[PDB]
Design a protein around this ligand. Structure first.
Ligand SMILES: [Mg+2]
Ligand SMILES: [Mg+2]
Ligand SMILES: [Mg+2]
Ligand SMILES: [Mg+2]
Ligand SMILES: [Mg+2]
Ligand SMILES: [Mg+2]
Ligand SMILES: [Mg+2]
Ligand SMILES: [Mg+2]
Ligand SMILES: [Mg+2]
Ligand SMILES: [Mg+2]
Ligand SMILES: [Mg+2]
Ligand SMILES: [Mg+2]
Ligand SMILES: [Mg+2]
Ligand SMILES: [Mg+2]
Ligand SMILES: [Mg+2]
Ligand SMILES: [Mg+2]
Lengths: 104, 220, 62, 252, 106, 53
RNA sequence: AUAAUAAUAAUAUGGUAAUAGAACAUUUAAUGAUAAUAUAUAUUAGUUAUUAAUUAAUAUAUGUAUUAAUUAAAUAGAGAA
RNA sequence: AAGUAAUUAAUAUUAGUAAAACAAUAAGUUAUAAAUAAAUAGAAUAAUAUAUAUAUAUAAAAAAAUAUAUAUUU
RNA sequence: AAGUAACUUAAGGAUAAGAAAUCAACAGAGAUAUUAUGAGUAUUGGUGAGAGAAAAUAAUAAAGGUCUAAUAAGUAUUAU
């Protein structure tokens, strides 16, 4: 099991190291000071009241998610609900067709 | 002795290059083929410089436009398929359709299939194959010939990425552990084409979800 | 490397082993002339063999 | 009635004797296909291969200074008129004795030509076939294949000398001596030799080094058409020969 | 599958210098895809058509003679056999006829 | 063929071995090629001058 | 049904600009016997329908042709600036 | 002491392979279908053009142009 | 012609660039640099002279991601 984990791609492994799955990170935006602050969401800083940009910028987050999908390790990553990105089959199914497609 | 000191080119391969400015009896003597004394003698005028008259790239009006939205399909005639079958190169298991990927594999179509394949009817008389075909589209006559043979055509939509995936699914698996999903037709023209029963478009023939959704939207 | 003469490309299009072009003299001053006579100038025209070589040199990738 | 009376099926396998190295002793025959070892000797193809290879080999270091490259000033030496002498510009002109060269090359000159891969393969086969015909293609092996006659006690099936690196008594060593003895036996002292190995035979090349000017030890991958043809007698490993055949076979 | 077969399976007639293939006999090998090597060629700027026949093993002269016998309708003059590469050129587009003649044996 | 080579002292080439189908043929070949050269060393084939008379 | 050489009959063979075909000298690279009775260069006189090479004599060098030949190439040929 | 080199395009001759070629990692270029400004069009319904394909035109033909078809695809 | 020659200034062993307010197109990719194809294609021009991408696929390449910022205002945007 440990060997299989080690065999995972580098970026994914790094992510797991620095945001581990024992902590249930929040689905919604949170305080930046919070422990359960989602790195994919923009969390608000409590003093200044300014939204900090996500700790994992959107491309990196997407890459991480794709890696998780590849190796079946999605649920151990923190939730990507309130980040607007969907991926692959879920994206395909859930999306509404454009107004131009349905109503030319 | 080694052959290495007795090798010649094949007769008719090589030539002596015309060597100028190297004596009178050579032929290409002092003037070196230039003629005598003009601009072309010692300098450079352009080959297509017409003298000052309005040139043949100016007299005439500029015509047409380049349709950048165009995506030219590679044409495959029924005749070629028939020939392949006769030669026993058309390897198909029963039930397996002769798709664009399959055609490429076989060597029916060859070179890069960028946008798709159209099936044309240049040997529709001697076509007698009951196998099922699937391409970007087919000629009406070709379709009729296929039907007569006891075959079954389906015009299938493929975006360039989707087409590529279809042709070489293993590459995508190797790279990413997952072949990409086949796109819906976003364009209006594309939707219209595959919604035609006369074209044997996949949206009507398979009774697709997109078409139904469009109909529902129209109703509402 | 060599490149296409863009004006020539705009004027001339390929037709097998020749080039086709539009006719000159049908952009203004058409009124007064016979319409039947003018219909000669409406279509396209194949390149004359005199300037075929020139056209080839202008359009190396055609 | 009979359409093509003289039609027939050609022969497809030539026997090459598999030998033990130090002393070229027949161990077995091995039927290599006719296309590799007994093609009709087409000179034109061979020529094409050789010239192409030679062109590839070129260093192309010719670098004479043109009138720009040459290092004089740009100043006009004598005024256009009123000098009583011929018209001159700068001192770099090809016309003058210290000036730069006209139409000067500039290194590194690229002399690389191309060849179709199939043509090259055909040439490679052809050279090998020619060598076989001559009686200058010594296939050494017996490790993989099933033998008829057993290998000798002091020979070995691969193309190498034993205990070459060992040198305890005197400065002279044994592998060199063995090589010299071999040369003496087969009457090829001054002749060009070409040892086509499969893997790096370090001891063999050490043994050769005395006769480096005539003996060329090459790998299976880096062997050339030129190398094969120049050779007065090639000494190829069976495995290496197999590999070459596989490489330059016409695909089906 | 194996490039060099074993010594047992190879017959004597399969070897070189057996069955007399050189003397007045020939073979015409098919292409990779499995077709007869007979081709139209449009030389001198599409002006000179000629039919080329490739991949001939053995005696080309004999083969040419046999083809002439088969096709008397083509003249005797128009059969140029180039000896360096061993291929036999015919003047017209006489490809299909040649193929028909060859098919039965090759 | 190996035996013949060993007794002879000379090497019969691989192509030749492939070609010749009988002992008689081998003998004839030997008589043709090696024998005269063995008899007279000036008559022997030289490599650098292959077209010698 | 070809190639080389030689016969016979016929026709053709002045040439600037130009086009086409075929050779030679020189230098380098690949292959490469041989040897002071030899090789190279020069001079003189012979020879071969001869920008070339060869024979002999004479001279000077060298223990010796990147030699003959086939290929690959060129800073490849000078009474004209 | 003077027609040279590089990157390209078009012809020709030969050689390799050939309905494919080059390349083999895929990708690409050329060929395999002719057109048309362009479009969702594209080559015998029962044979040589008197048939068919495309562009103009049209209900569909005819008409101009080019192309495609008479054991084996070029 | 050319942001070339030149002059001027400033740095380092290299500099520059670099982990998307990027591309793409309803499928997707995943920093930058250099090269090959894409392609002399799209694009543009007193529509003359001429100029001319990108996506995508390959190589070369290194572990290539990673916080150092309390997440940014006379800024984005607009007019000129
Ligand atoms: Mg002249
Ligand atoms: Mg004048
Ligand atoms: Mg003059
Ligand atoms: Mg002039
Ligand atoms: Mg009139
Ligand atoms: Mg060359
Ligand atoms: Mg004359
Ligand atoms: Mg000179
Ligand atoms: Mg002089
Ligand atoms: Mg003179
Ligand atoms: Mg209309
Ligand atoms: Mg500018
Ligand atoms: Mg830096
Ligand atoms: Mg920010
Ligand atoms: Mg911000
Ligand atoms: Mg502004």
């Amino acid at each position: 099991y440990k060997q299989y984990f080690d065999s995972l791609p580098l970026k994914l492994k790094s992510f797991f190291q620095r945001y581990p799955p024992s902590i249930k990170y929040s689905p919604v935006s949170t305080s930046t000071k919070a422990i359960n602050a989602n790195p994919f969401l923009p969390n608000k800083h409590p003093v200044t009241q300014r939204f900090h940009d996500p700790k994992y910028s959107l491309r990196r987050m997407s890459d991480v998610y794709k890696l998780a999908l590849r190796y079946g390790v999605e649920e151990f990553l923190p939730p990507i609900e309130n980040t607007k990105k969907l991926f692959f089959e879920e994206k395909y199914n859930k999306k509404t067709l454009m107004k131009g497609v349905l109503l030319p | 002795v080694s052959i290495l000191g007795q090798l010649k080119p094949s007769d008719g391969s090589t030539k002596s290059f015309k060597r100028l400015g190297r004596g009178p009896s050579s032929g290409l003597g002092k003037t070196s083929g230039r003629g005598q004394k003009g601009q072309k003698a010692r300098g450079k005028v352009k080959s297509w410089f017409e003298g000052g008259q309005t040139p043949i790239y100016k007299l005439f009006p500029k015509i047409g436009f380049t349709n950048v939205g165009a995506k030219p399909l590679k044409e495959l005639n029924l005749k070629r398929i028939q020939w392949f079958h006769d030669k026993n190169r058309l390897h198909l298991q029963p039930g397996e359709v002769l798709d664009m990927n399959k055609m490429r594999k076989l060597g029916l179509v060859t070179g890069p299939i960028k946008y798709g394949v159209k099936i044309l009817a240049s040997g529709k008389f001697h076509y007698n194959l009951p196998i099922a075909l699937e391409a970007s589209r087919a000629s009406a006559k070709a379709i009729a010939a296929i039907e007569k043979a006891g075959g079954k055509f389906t015009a299938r939509y493929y975006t360039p990425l989707g087409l590529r995936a279809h042709l070489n699914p293993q590459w995508f698996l190797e790279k990413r552990g997952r072949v990409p999903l086949q796109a819906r037709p976003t364009k209006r023209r594309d939707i219209d084409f595959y919604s035609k029963e006369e074209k044997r478009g996949y949206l009507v023939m398979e009774k697709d979800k997109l078409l139904q959704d469009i109909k529902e939207a129209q109703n509402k | 490397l060599m490149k296409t003469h863009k004006g020539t490309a705009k004027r001339w299009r390929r037709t097998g082993n020749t080039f086709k072009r539009g006719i000159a003299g049908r952009k203004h001053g058409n009124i007064g002339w016979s319409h039947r006579s003018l219909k000669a100038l409406t279509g396209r025209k194949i390149a004359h063999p005199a300037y075929s070589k020139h056209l080839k040199r202008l359009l190396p990738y055609h | 009635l009979n359409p093509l009376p003289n039609a027939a099926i050609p022969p497809k396998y030539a026997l090459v004797t598999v030998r033990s190295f130090p002393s070229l002793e027949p161990l077995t025959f091995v039927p290599v296909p006719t296309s590799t070892v007994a093609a009709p000797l087409r000179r034109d193809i061979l020529w094409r291969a050789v010239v192409y290879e030679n062109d590839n080999r070129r260093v192309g270091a010719s670098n004479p200074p043109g009138r720009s490259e040459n290092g004089f000033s740009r100043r006009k030496l004598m005024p256009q008129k009123g000098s009583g002498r011929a018209r001159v510009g700068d001192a770099n002109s090809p016309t003058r004795h210290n000036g730069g060269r006209a139409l000067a090359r500039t290194a590194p000159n690229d002399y690389t030509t191309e060849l179709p891969s199939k043509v090259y393969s055909m040439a490679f086969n052809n050279a090998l076939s020619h060598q076989y015909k001559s009686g200058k293609l010594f296939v050494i092996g017996g490790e993989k294949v099933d033998l008829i006659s057993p290998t000798p006690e002091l020979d070995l099936n691969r193309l190498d000398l034993v205990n070459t690196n060992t040198v305890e008594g005197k400065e002279i060593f044994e592998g060199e001596v063995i090589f010299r003895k071999f040369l003496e036996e087969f009457q090829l002292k001054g002749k060009r030799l070409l040892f086509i190995t499969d893997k790096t035979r370090e001891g063999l090349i050490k043994s050769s080094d005395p006769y480096k000017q005539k003996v060329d030890v090459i790998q299976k991958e880096l062997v050339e058409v030129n190398d094969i043809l120049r050779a007065q007698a090639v000494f190829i490993e069976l495995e290496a020969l197999e590999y070459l055949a596989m490489a330059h076979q016409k695909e089906i | 599958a194996p490039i060099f077969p074993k010594l047992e399976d190879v017959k004597m007639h399969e070897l070189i210098g057996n069955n007399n293939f050189g003397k007045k006999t020939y073979y015409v090998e098919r292409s990779r895809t499995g077709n007869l090597p007979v081709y139209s060629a449009y030389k001198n700027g599409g002006n000179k058509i000629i039919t080329e026949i490739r991949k001939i093993e053995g005696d080309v002269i004999q083969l040419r003679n046999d083809l002439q016998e088969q096709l008397p309708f083509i003249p005797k003059k128009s059969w140029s056999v180039v000896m360096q590469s061993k291929k036999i050129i015919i003047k017209g587009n006489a490809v299909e006829a040649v193929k028909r003649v060859l098919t039965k044996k090759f | 063929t190996k035996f013949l080579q060993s007794k002879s002292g000379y090497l019969i080439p691989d192509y030749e071995l492939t070609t010749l189908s009988t002992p008689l043929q081998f003998k004839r070949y030997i008589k043709e090629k090696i024998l005269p050269s063995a008899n007279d060393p000036k008559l022997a084939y030289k490599e650098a001058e292959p077209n010698a008379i």
